[PDB]
Every structure is written in C-alpha cells, then in structure tokens.
Subunit: 487 residues, 4 copies
C-alpha cells in the first residue's frame, strides 16, 4: 500500500482519510442522481429537517462507503448529526462517494482496496471523537465496530486488575490477531477508552444478518453493553434488500468481474435464505441452470418448488461453472472442492467475511499461483492439474467488491429503517425505554417505510373502508398484518 | 317428516353417510392409491405412528374439503386409531368419488358436490352428531363453520337452559344464519345439551386456513373461545407452500376447466397480494397474462411492484381487465358497480373466502339481469344495459375447489401432515396443562420435520452441518435452523 | 348387416350425422357462443366475407379435431356459403357437445370422444362420402389421414379398374392399415370410382400440422400428390403461436385434468425442442418443474441450454424423472426398455403425433403387465417385476386433446383464420394456374393480417410507420414488414 | 481529443493506432480467459490451423474492437491471414483488447471515445494496405466499410469524366459530410483507390441486421460490387447473439452506466425483433414492467403472448423510467417525447447509429444543458422544466458503449459463422461460385456452429437411428430441419 495512516483535515478541521479527494465532484454528481432514487431518505429529510432531531449528536457508522451510504450520511447530517464513518469491507468503498462525503459532510476513513490493518485503523478512526468523547450512536453493518468495543471493554477489565494484555498468539485467526494487537496498543495509551465509550453509547443499529447473529449471541451471554436495534429483520429490509438487492447486484458483480455469459451455464448457490433466494433468482432468470445447497429442509423445499435442483456441493463440484456462497456460515467451499473444479470456474461469496470460501487453504496450498487479471478478479492455478479457478474479491462480498452493491432504490428501504432506528434510540436516550437487548422496529414503521416508496413507482394503494377494516380486524391506517406474519 | 327430508344411509356395518353416488367408490379408491404416493408426509406418519395407535378411543369430526387429498388425511387418522365423521366445508368442493370411497371404507361422510346451503349445514350437524356415546374429542376445521356451530349451539343451549326459549330464524336477516338458527332450534328437540357436552369433552380444534384463524382470534379476544386451537395455517410448511404454490397450481386449473380461456395475452387483476395472491399472480404471469394487483398493505404492494406487477386500484382497471381473482379474505372487493363496468365475458372469481368478496347479492338483484348457466359452476350473468355478460365461477365461492380439484396432493401432504401433528399434539395433551382456551402454533422443529419428510420424494439432497458449522451459526445440528421470527 | 353396424342418423332436414349424444347440443351452443368472442379472426372473416358468399356451391370435408374451436371454424365456413361434412382426426379429441351442436345446426359430423380405430376410419369415410352430387371440392386436414385415404383409395381403384382385384387386409401386418384396406374394399362395392372422381374435382387441401405437412412433402417428392396443398402449419401465425403458446396452455391442462399431479418440484423430460417442445418446456418450467430436454438437433439443443434447461439423452434421466412428454413427430422415443426403468407412477404422454412416440405396442405385450384404467384416458400399467406402475395418458395419443380440451380459442383463432384464408385462396383459384400439385404457404401479408386481426381484442396498440420510416427500413407502410426468410 | 492521427508501428513494422499500448498485458490476460469461452473459434483453429487456409490473405475488419473480436482476429491469424482492423463504433473498443492485438497479432486503429473524424480516419487506415493493394477480404459490422468503398467507386466514376468532386454541402447529415470530404481528399491523391480495391476484394461478410439491410438495398439496385455473406441471418447468429446476447448486455450497460434499480420500474422497449425480444426478456426478468412498441403486428402479438403490454410511445412517455430503442429505424424517440419524460428517465439505443433517439434535436434544443456524469452517461437538462434525462453513450449502442457488449460464449457463435463465411469466400476466390449478390451459409454449417458449442455446456445430443432419420425424412448427420424452418 502507498497509504500513509495519518489523518488529513478539511479546511474547517474535519478529519478524513480517502483515496483521492479529487473525485469529490464526481461523487456529488452521482449522489445527486441517487437522491432521486431514494425517496424514503429524502422524505425523512423533509419530515425531520425542521426539528433537527440529531442536533448535538455524534454518530459513528461502519457501513459500506457507497453512493447509497452517502445519501444516508447526508440524511443524518441534514437532521443535525455530526458524523464519522468507515467502510465495513476492504473492497466496498466507492472512492468518489467517500471523497464527496469527506469534502462536504462528514469525517470518512475509507478507500477501495484497504489492507486489513488499514481496515482496522479506519475503524478506530471512525470511533475516535477525541478527548471530548463519543460516539453517542453507532450504525453498524456486520458487527465489527460493536465487536471492537466489546472486546476492548473485556480487555480493559483484565488489564485494570492484573496488567495483562491481549496476546495475538491466543488466536490463529490472522485478522483477529490484528484486532487484539490494536486493543493492546490502545491499553498502552488509554486503558479506559472503551469503558468511557460504552458509557456514552445510547445504542447501535445493525444492518445485516451476520451482525444481528453476533448481537443475539451477546444478548444470550449477557455481554451486550447497550441497546441494539436489528434493522436487518424489518420486513422492508430482509425481504427487499437481501432478496431483490442481490437479485440485482450478484449478476452485476459477475458481469463486471468476468464478463462471463451466465446463460447456458450451471451455477451453484450455497444457501437459500433471503440472499440465496435472490441470487438463485438472478441466475435462473439470466438462463443459468441453478443448483442449490441447503441445510434447512424448509428452504430446500422452497428451492424445489421454484424448479431448482437441491444437491450437496460434492455432487456438482466438477460440473458447475459458477459458485456463489450465501450462507453466513463457514467452510462452504474448501480447498478440496476447489481442486476438483473445471478450469476457470468462478467462485465467489456474497454472504460474509472471508471464510465461506476457504481462502486460507487456497493461499497456503503448496505450489499454487495467483494471477491477478484485474483488481478483484484473480485466477489461481493449481500445480497438480495446471488448471485454474477464478476467485472474486478475494472471497469477500463480491457484489460490493466487484461492482457497486445494491442499487439506490432498495438501499433507501434499508436506510430509511436505519434513520428510524437511530431516531428512536436518540429520542429515547434519557427515557429508559430500551434495555441492553436487541429490538426490532414496530410494524407500523416498517409499513411506513414501504409506503414512502410507492409513489416513486406509481403504485396506487387501495384504502379500506371502516367496514372492511373491521371485517379483517385491522385499523384503516394499519398495521395490516399480525405480529408473526411472514410476507 | 318431509318428502324431501335429508336422511342418512348406512353401510352394511351400520356406519352413516350421505354422498352423491356410492358406486363411485372404486374410482375414488383408484385415485386415493395414486395420491398416497404423492403424499409422503402422510404415509410416513402412518408408518411412524400406526403401530402405537395414538388416537385409540378418539373421535374426530372434520370439515376439510372432501377431496382425494382429504381422503388420504382421513385414512391416516383412522390408521392411527381414530374414529372419524366428516363433512365438506364448501358446497362445491367435494370430489364425489373421494367421498364414496371414504364412506364405504373408512369414515362417516356427509358430502357431495353441489350442496344447497340447507344441505351444507345439515351435513355439518351430522358430522358432529356422534350419537349416544358422545363426541367428538377432536375437531379438524377449515374456515371455522364447525367451530362456529358449536359456539352458537352453546349459546342457544344456555338460553334454553335458562328460559326454555328456542332460536328463531326470524331474528336475523342474514339468509345463511337463518339456516343455522333453524338447525340449532330443531337440534334442541333431539339433544338440548349436545353442545354443552361437546365443549366439556372437546380437546381442541386444528384450523386449516387464514380466515378460520381470524375467526379464532376474534373468539379468543372476546373471551368466548371454548377450547384450545392450533393454527395450522401459519406453520411455514402450510402458509408458504399451500397458500402460495397450491394456488399457483389450482388457480389456472380452475380457470381452464371452467372456461377454457387463454390466459396468455390477457390482463388479469389479482385483488390482494398475501400468500394466495402471490401464488395466483405468479400463475397468471407464468401463463403469459399481464397481472395487475390491488392491495391495501404497502409492504405487499411494494413486493408486487418488485416482481414486475402493476399496482392499481380496481377502479383504474375494471373496464380493461379480462380476468378478476379475489384473494383477500375480506368483503366487498368486486361490487355490482364494478361489474357493470366490465367488458363482455370478463371472468370474475374468488379464491379467498366465503361468497362475499364478489357482490353476489348485488348481482342477484340487479334489475333485468339474467343468469345463464353454461355448465355447473360457470355462469354468465347478462347485463341488460349493454347486452354483455360477466362469467362468474362457482357462484363466487372458492373457484379452485369448485371448478377444478383444488390443490394437488403433494402440497396438501405438507398441510395435512401439519394437521396430523396438530391433532396428535392436542390429544397427547388431552389431560395436560399445556393448551388453554387460546390459539397456538406448532413449534419450528415440527414445521421442519414436515418439510424434511417431503424432500426424498423430490430427490432433494440436504447437507448436514458439521458440529463446528452448527455452532458458528448458533443452531443445533438437528435444528431448528432459524430464529423464532424468521420469515422464509 | 351386423347387429353392431355403424349407421348414420339424420336431422329433421335429412342431414347425416353420428355423434355421442345429440342432447348435448344446447351446451355445445353455449360454449360456442363464448368461443366466438375469443376468436376475433374468425368473426372478422365472417363480417368481411359473409355477404359475398365466396364458398357458394363449395363442398368442404374437414378433419380438424372436433372441438368447440373447430365448431367456430365450421360455422365460419358455412357463414361464407360452404356446405360441410366433418370428422375428427383423433379418437379422443372430440368434444361431444361441440359435435352435437354442429350436427344439429350447421354440418354433417361423424365424431365422438372414445372412438375405436374401426369407428375412426368409418367416420373419415363418411365425412368424405357426399353421395350422388359428389364432393368434396375442398379438404381441411390435420395430420393427413383424410388425404391418405384418398390417395390409397385412388391406388386401389386403379388396381380394380385394371383387374377387378380388391384390397386384402391380409396383405399387411399393420393393424391400422388393415382397417383402411377393409374400408376401401367395402367401399369399392358401393362406388368404385369414388376417389377418382374426388381427385378430378378436389381443388386442394389445407393441412394443419407439422406431421401432416411431412406426409405432403413425401407425396410431392414421390410424384403421387394428387392436388394442391397449402401448408397452414408453417404460417408464422400458426407455427409460432399454436404450436408454441397453444401447448404452453394445453400441456399443463392435460396433465392436471388427467392426474391432478403437482408439477412444481418434479423433474420433467421433454423429448424434442421444436415449437411444441419449446411450449411444453416453458409450461413445465413456469409451473416449477425442473425440465430436461432431449434433442437430435444441435441448434434446438443449444436453444434449450440458453433457456436454462439441461439437455441429456433419455437414458440419462429415465429412472429419475417424474413426467415424460414426447413432442417429436418421430417414432420410437420412449421404448418399453425405458419404461421398465421408470419410477412408480411416472407419467408418460405424447403431444406430438400418432401412437408411436411411446412404444404402446411393446407395452401391450410386456409379459405379465397389467393395465388398470384409472378413468378414461388415464391408465396405470403395472410392471410385474417391480409391482410399480407408469401412468400412460390417452393411450399414447395426443394428450392435450385427449385428456383436456386442446388449445384455447384465442390461439386457435390464429390457426383457423389461416385455414379460412387457405380455403379461400384454393377456391378462388379453382380454375386458375396458380396452384399445381405441390405444397405452398400463404404469403406474408396474409400472415400479418391474421395477427393484426387479433390485436384489438388484447388492447395492443400498434404503431404506424411514417412514409419516411418505412423507406428507411425498406418496407411498405402497410407491410409486409419482414424479409422472406425472417424467423421471428 | 489529444490523439495525433499518425500511425505508429510495432518493432516489426506493423501499423497501429490505439489509446494505450501499455494495456496489452491486461488485454492478453482477458483474451486468455475468453478463449476458453469461445470453443467454436478454438475448434476452428485446431481444424484449419494445419492447412493455413488464409496464408497469403489480407483481411480488413470493421467490427467492434472487443476482447471477443480479439479472439476472432487471432483465429484469422492462426489460420494464416494478415489482418488490419478498426472498430465500427466510436465507443465500443475495449482499449486493452486493441493494445494486445496491435502488439501481438494485427494492425488495429481503434480506441474508446473516438470522434467521428477519428472513426473515419481509422476506417481508412484499416483499408489502407499500401501500394501493393488489398484487402482481399472484408469482415464488416453495420456496413460502413462497405459504404465507403461503394461511395468511393461512384465518386471516382464521376471524377474521371467531369473532374467533379463530392461536395459535403449536398448532405445535411453531419457524419456523411465527413465521409464525402474524405472521399474528396482521396480523389486528390489517388482517383482510382476504390476501383483498384473493389477489383481485388473477393467478398465481404456482414455481422448485423442493419448492415445486411444495406447489402440487400445494394443488391436490389444493382450497385453491389462483390459477393456478400449475410452472417446475421445464420440461425446461430440472429437467434443467439441478437436475442441472448442483448439479454445479457442490455442490463449490464444499464447497471454500469447508472446503477439504477431495474426492479420496480417501467421500461419501454421500442421494437420486438430479436434484439427487442432479448432486451424485453432481460428487463422483465429483472423485475421491470415492460411496455413494447411495435409496427409489425406479428411481433406485437408475440409480445402480448409473453405478458407484455403493447402501446405507442406517446401513451407511456411520461410514465416510463427506462427507454430502449431496438428498431434499426430512425426517429423513434424525438425531442418532443424527451421533453415529456420524468426527471432522470434513462434513454438509450441498442439498435443502430445515432438516430433512433433524436440526438440532433436534443443537442440543438435552445437553452438545453449537458452535464456529463461520467464517460457515456450524460444528463441533459431542459430549460422549460428544469428537469433532466439521462442519455447513454450519446445515443449510440449502449451495450458496447457503457459496458462490454455481448459475452464471449455467444460471440463465439457469431464469430464462428464469420470464420466459416471468410473461409468460403476465400477458398472459392478463383471458382466463380459466388456472384455479386448476398448469400447465407447453408444449414449444415449453421448446425455445425451449434454443435461446436454443446460440449462446453455439457449438453448431450441424441443420435437418430437410421430408421428414425428416415421416418422424419432427414439424414442421420443432418441437416435436420427444412429450409424455411424458423426455430
Ligand atoms: N452482500 C450483500 O449485499 C448482502 C445482502 C444481505 C445480507 N448479506 C449477508 O448474506 C448472508 C446471508 O444472509 P441471509 O439474510 O440470506 O441469511 P439467512 O439466514 O436468511 O440465509 C442463510 C441460509 O444459509 C443456509 N446455510 C447455512 N449453512 C449452510 C451450509 N453449510 N450449506 C448450505 N446452506 C447453508 C441456511 O440454512 C440459510 O437458509 C449473511 O452473511 C448476511 O449478512 C449480504
Ligand atoms: N447492440 C447489439 O449488440 C446488437 C445485437 C444485434 C443486432 N443489433 C442491431 O439491433 C437492431 C435490431 O436488430 P434485430 O435483429 O432485432 O432486427 P429486427 O428486424 O429483428 O427487429 C427490429 C424490430 O423493430 C420494429 N420496428 C421498426 N420500426 C419501428 C418503429 N418505428 N417503432 C417500433 N418498432 C419498430 C420492427 O417491426 C422489428 O420487429 C439492428 O440495428 C441491428 O443491427 C445490435
Ligand atoms: Na450499487
Ligand atoms: Na387437486
Ligand atoms: Na381447449
Ligand atoms: Na462483453
């Protein structure tokens, strides 16, 4: 890397670190377009702008630094917030979005193609509100910022007693060694950094399935330090972004990274949850023959109902042309599988982290060679066979890494939920309404998010008469469905 | 009694029935034997539970539509030891050959295709009336009419106990409810504590469908619900399969049998976009129609638009569309005023509930209108103003069951394995604590079991989590695999 | 003659017929009246050409399947002045109510659902035999059996003229051809120059389907074709609509009526991927089956793969698949050897041609096999080796027409407006030059007219080229719009 | 432009002009991938390599200078040809493909973002075989090289008699003024350039519908100077490339250029021929509600059968979000239409030239303003309304201009037909088999193209028995369909 890990500042004194500030004008042009595609965000600015509900608030966000996220940030700032941000993936930043935000609106520490050390430095920077303290609020995607704070508190409690430091030797996970080393270094400067932080944090709102999994784990073990709102599981997030967003951005990533024809191919989708449903839909609708793997018999049965074959990976590894992992689990596509794939099979992950595909096993395979075709398209050649596979985005989120992730309209659904969650936490900061638990937004607000997006599309809703509303036992104004309704 | 009185017949062994034609039993058996192969969950239930006879001594009254699929369910209950009496929950949904085979071989059945409402309610009363040994212990219901009769019967019996007063159909202007009050009145002459006994003995009801479950929550909210209920509809393996994929199959089947109309190239309106509407819209669009959805729920409307469907109000499209399908579970969707604007030979049907999604009452009384029956369950109503018609299917009642055969066996095996599980759970807790006078759903592990029992038939090969992987996603190797509030 | 002799009946006015049940005429009329609305091309043909009576004096024999759709075609021919006699070209395809309404109201008809082959050929002979005034002038054929009878009849008459020898069914081992030779033999006793007269007078034949057109080219190549032929199948508005979208409709309809099987979740094999196979595969995949295609043509195979369908040989999939559909127009696609490998209750059907895509002969003679009829046109053949069955639809004959109602009216209006146009063209050139003893297709401007006549019904609004735009793409404003070899 | 219109030369003396030669290594990496996706081309190299059928031949091609075309060029050269090339569109060149070819294989005059003067200069250069003469063979796409030769001959015949030059004032078409001026300049150096050329040209093979239209016009008016093979109308070209290729590359162009969500939108496809069918399929399968316009009642009826609404443009102009022209005709989307479109409606052309969309009217609208978002995405703002539209690739082919055009696999079908057509013309150069008319390849070769692509996809063909072949009256080895079969 040529990056020097020293913050820069705007003329006004606001910190940042981005690839290229000269891209700000281009960022602004695309943000202007995105705004039109994001009516829920823009409506939120109109509704809440006058009252400046986030005046005086300090918000840290660790969410992919895209054009979409720029619109979200500029909604928080339109509402009065001061904001610091980082990306939650080393390849997901759109550098022009980051530049525009750094120039005009918020402190940003993000660039496309970070190293893992840089990633974690940016995370620290986004949390670093200086001696006065902060953040008041956190917007998280995947849970890494939340993780750092919780791990930090734990380390601080040990250090305070015995003077023991985290030891990277205690983990075999190369990235978690980084984390432990950063926590150690922080103890050596301020051994109560995270204590002070957690005592000020009003809450976190979490974007994605994997992050929410991490939250429920912390709830269950009594370690969660502050309230959390699960944004993922709003209906208007999970059943839109995860599904329709990947239906858009999976083929976009494939096409940009490889230009491969999807029609006529065999594609394997590991998992058939919301993401796998959307990926399988895209591949099928592009003319691929899609094979699904699953552990959940209900999801497997759904896939069969949709005309998809359900097999185990071992039955199709030498046949398939394209492999997509969507599971949120580890150890889906191992080195042993990769070695059996046809020459130039495309292997990618749209789920989580770097461990759905066995990138560790690949990189450490004796005699393997990596040929970079272009950024985020790598061909790995095996010495036994002298054939190769194509790995996208080093096994990290392929849609954001190889293309631009989901489009604005669907991200407006997700991010209107984020605004609503942040407003709820902040408005209730002094009320005691929320405990140190995980909450979801109520149905009437989930419905409001949908309703805010109808006019853009020309969708005309019918109004119940009072008689009709009574007949199905709902209010005229909703909510319209029972608590456990699945849509 | 009356020349035209409805009277039960009896098999050689004395078991009561009333069906269209007992000579259709052999045909019924032939199609049941095919259905069994298509219903692995039910057959697996027979293999697993048959030897232990878990329903020994239990009496079950059911009202699931008297189809070939229901026949396999009935014969699973009897394989498990139950004694069964049955009726259909719709006047047009019985498959007469299914009813005959069951009547001959397995259970008392009071059902035929083309009942009147008077006949319908008589059949329901008969399915309930077990004679001096009492019963039922268990109820399987679809839409809640059996449950309603019991609750209304208790109320009438209370009044009778206090004052000796009988119900009086003159007290209501609801044509159907007049029939119900009449049934109860005449029933007090034979056994004025029928329903009180029943509600001391009934263990619970398991309810098939969305509208029936609405009715159960209304009774729970008002404190009138008399016994526990399991909401089978809201198992994932019911709602997300039957309501969705079932209708995807049976909607076009009903249209094609009733009318033979080409769906391709048409404009079709689907009112509602819940599970049934989603499946109907899918079928229509799959077949080459251009589908327009109406909705009241902004989430469902946004879903439709994501799927490439136009969302409008009915008024916007009523003069243009060729096919109209109501899926709402609500009233007053397609009114006479709408019908008067429709083109010649627009097809109008209901796959949701009852007879009131389409304004059949308003149609009946429209001045100068003429109903011309094309064939059973296809009727062309001619508007005098224009000398044009609309084609109403199944008199505005469930078109899939009324004009075709309803859902296919495989998906009904999913629904009905949930029914068997529900029945077993209610009975196995007959003397327990676990179920109060409230509505319950089956637990996720059993929902997953239902799906798992259907995979082999389709050749679907499931992956097994390693222990390490199961821990990584915080689930047990054996499931359940998803959080409580997962939506699939 | 024989106790069981087939004898014609006569209407009050003396017109001959033989149908299942004349009492079904009113029902037939009701459904014809609905079909008319769905068949704008035919109704427009009546409006345009009715007053000029272009078929005055013409006698037309037809064999298009005797459906409600065909009824609208017949009544278009009669509206234009023709006298008509008709039979069905399949033993299972007649809709008896359609046949009765036509027999009552419009034309001599010899057709019922469930004919024997002996009855089939008798009906064909009757549709041809006009009595002393002679006829037909024109033939409408589907599959070529009527055309074949005439050609075989001429040959027999030649032999008879030369030597007085009659055909002898002993001369052939082909069971069906024995029947044909018998018909001709007995026909020489009544009119030994029937077919010679016919082939001096017949103006031409218009042929509906791919296999019939194959037969016509074989006769043209060998120099035996006796009169002009118009290949209606290969109008774009026939092949690319009926064969494709028609089957997309009528394949699933046949499956659902015959078996009620859930298509979703199954594996379905479609043998062939021409127009019919494309439409069948589309329906199956639309319905949620996983479709595997077999093909001999690499172009068609590549098309299937582009559409996300697996292409394999039958042998690769015979033990796994749930549904098999032959679409080829070829012989010996699904042999007994294949059938013996199929799973219990695999469904096996033919939508292509004749009775020889599936090896029904081999099935019949398989040692120990047992045919169990479930209901008409659904038969379960039980293999003794495994005590498992296969479900054969319509005895291996066209399953869509045999198990359901064939294509719907709208798409048949496209096909049948081409038939009317073909008939008009042959007749209007009755004394001309234009048509020799060869196969012709209709010109593109008429193909376009057929489509144009169907747009209004669907609300499709066509753009008009400016003069400048028409010149830019080198077409006339009024069309034709595409080059001769355009494939659509 | 910063381009200097002077040829460069390789070390070996071969001429070229490309954007950036340093991109050759990257070009080569992607060509290596494409080869695997192009089995028909690679099989052609294996079959015909030994015999070197194009040894001694000089081939000019004017076909989009993509990675796909690079594989085609390198098949011609593997077979012995010496090659000169240009792109047939100002935005379709992939600069890394051009560089690799310029370095390794053939003279290339092509770059992404040419001006029209540069485009025509490159065309001249690709035809310029120096004093020895050439080309022997032409590969054309859209007919511009063919046009230049025919117009040139005509001008030469006039000039030879009266000394009259072409006069650009005789056309109001800005681009045809360029052409006439280049012909005039050429008369002033060699007044028999095109005569000599045409007397040596063995034939042309033409890629696309519009080009074939131009050929049939020249046939019909007796002006066609040499044999032509219509490659477009091979079944394995028209019903694959035009259909499935656009089903891939239309959404790719939209997504790269705009990142707009297609799902939930209304999209208008003008035309429903092969290209419009493929575009409508893509849009529908992505979740857009597609409205088709058509002049051909058969095509309109097909669209209705597929569940698409057929209307005139005027009925939907203010509703639709995305407009795609596929017609090969002019004056589809006029200025008057554009002025009625909603803010940020996307307008693009995947058919031909620059006149499906009224780019002239737009550019000359008083007070209009153009804002370039990024190359090939332009927002035009109207003064009456102060709202804008988004024009892709300046109204030129959007798939090639905004993305990378069709993928390799389908282009292997098209380009195997091109190889076969060139081999036919060249092998028959001295035989008199071909007249000055337009031919199509025979069915057995069309079938061979398909068959060459089956193994890649795992498609297993059934073999007819002799009895079966007889039954349907075809040979065991084909061809399998009648002459007029439409597939
Ligand atoms: N890249 C993006 O833009 C994007 C969008 C949304 C969510 N996500 C991420 O995608 C992942 C999936 O999210 P989701 O909402 O679909 O979750 P989900 O829980 O709905 O679906 C995951 C599915 O994977 C299955 N599965 C688990 N282990 C498996 C294994 N070993 N083999 C096969 N199947 C297995 C599960 O049964 C489940 O159905 C999460 O990591 C989430 O954070 C990414
Ligand atoms: N960009 C690409 O990669 C690509 C791929 C193949 C072909 N092409 C080009 O695409 C264009 C279309 O090719 P095609 O093969 O589909 O041609 P086609 O002739 O099959 O289809 C064009 C259609 O446009 C219709 N049409 C003509 N004028 C119209 C008007 N005013 N309004 C509406 N419809 C109108 C015609 O009726 C016709 O059906 C041609 O210019 C061709 O060269 C481009
Ligand atoms: Na994006
Ligand atoms: Na059914
Ligand atoms: Na029909
Ligand atoms: Na490309």
């Amino acid at each position: 890397s040529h990056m020097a890990l020293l913050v820069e500042k705007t003329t006004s004194g606001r910190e940042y670190k981005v690839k290229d500030m000269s891209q700000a004008d281009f960022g602004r042009l695309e943000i202007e377009l995105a705004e039109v595609e994001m009516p829920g965000l823009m409506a939120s600015r109109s509704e809440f702008g006058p009252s400046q509900p986030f005046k005086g608030a300090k918000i840290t966000g660790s969410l992919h630094m895209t054009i979409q996220t720029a619109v979200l940030i500029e909604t928080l700032t339109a509402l009065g917030a001061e904001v610091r941000w980082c990306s939650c993936n080393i390849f997901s930043t759109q550098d022009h979005a980051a530049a525009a935000i750094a120039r005009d609106s918020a402190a940003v520490f993000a660039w496309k193609g970070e190293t893992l050390q840089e990633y974690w430095w940016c995370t620290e920077r986004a949390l670093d509100w200086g001696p006065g303290g902060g953040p008041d609020l956190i917007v998280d995607d995947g849970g890494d910022t939340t993780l750092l704070i919780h791990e930090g508190v734990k380390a601080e409690e040990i250090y305070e007693k015995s003077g023991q430091f985290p030891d990277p030797d205690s983990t075999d996970n190369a990235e978690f060694k980084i984390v432990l080393s950063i926590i150690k270094e922080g103890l050596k400067t301020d051994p109560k950094r995270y204590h002070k932080m957690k005592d000020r944090v009003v809450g976190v709102s979490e974007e994605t399935t994997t992050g929410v999994k991490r939250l429920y784990q912390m709830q269950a073990n009594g370690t969660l330090l502050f309230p959390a709102i699960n944004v993922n599981d709003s209906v208007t997030k999970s059943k839109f972004d995860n599904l329709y967003g990947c239906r858009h951005s999976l083929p976009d990533g494939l096409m940009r990274a490889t230009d491969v024809m999807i029609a006529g191919k065999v594609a394997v989708v590991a998992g058939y949850g919301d993401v796998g449903k959307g990926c399988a839909a895209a591949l099928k609708q592009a003319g691929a023959r899609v094979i699904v793997t699953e552990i959940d018999p209900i999801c497997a049965l759904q896939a069969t109902m949709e005309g998809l074959q359900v097999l185990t990976l071992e039955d199709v590894v030498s046949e398939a042309d394209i492999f997509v992992t969507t599971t949120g689990n580890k150890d889906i596509i191992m080195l042993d599988h990769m070695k059996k794939m046809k020459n130039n099979a495309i292997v990618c992950n749209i789920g989580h982290f770097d461990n759905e595909i066995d990138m560790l096993g690949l990189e450490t395979h004796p005699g393997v060679k990596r040929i970079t075709i272009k950024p985020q398209t790598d061909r790995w050649v095996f010495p036994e066979t002298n054939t190769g596979i194509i790995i996208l985005a080093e096994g990290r989120l392929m849609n954001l890494g190889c293309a631009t992730g989901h489009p604005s309209f669907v991200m407006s659904c997700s991010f209107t939920n984020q605004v609503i969650a942040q407003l709820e936490l902040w408005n209730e900061k002094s009320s005691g309404k929320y405990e140190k638990k995980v909450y979801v937004l109520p149905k009437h607000l989930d419905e409001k998010v949908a309703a805010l997006h109808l006019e853009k599309l020309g969708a005309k809703l019918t109004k119940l008469s009072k008689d009709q509303a009574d007949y199905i036992s709902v209010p005229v104004e909703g909510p319209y469905k029972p608590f456990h309704y699945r849509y």
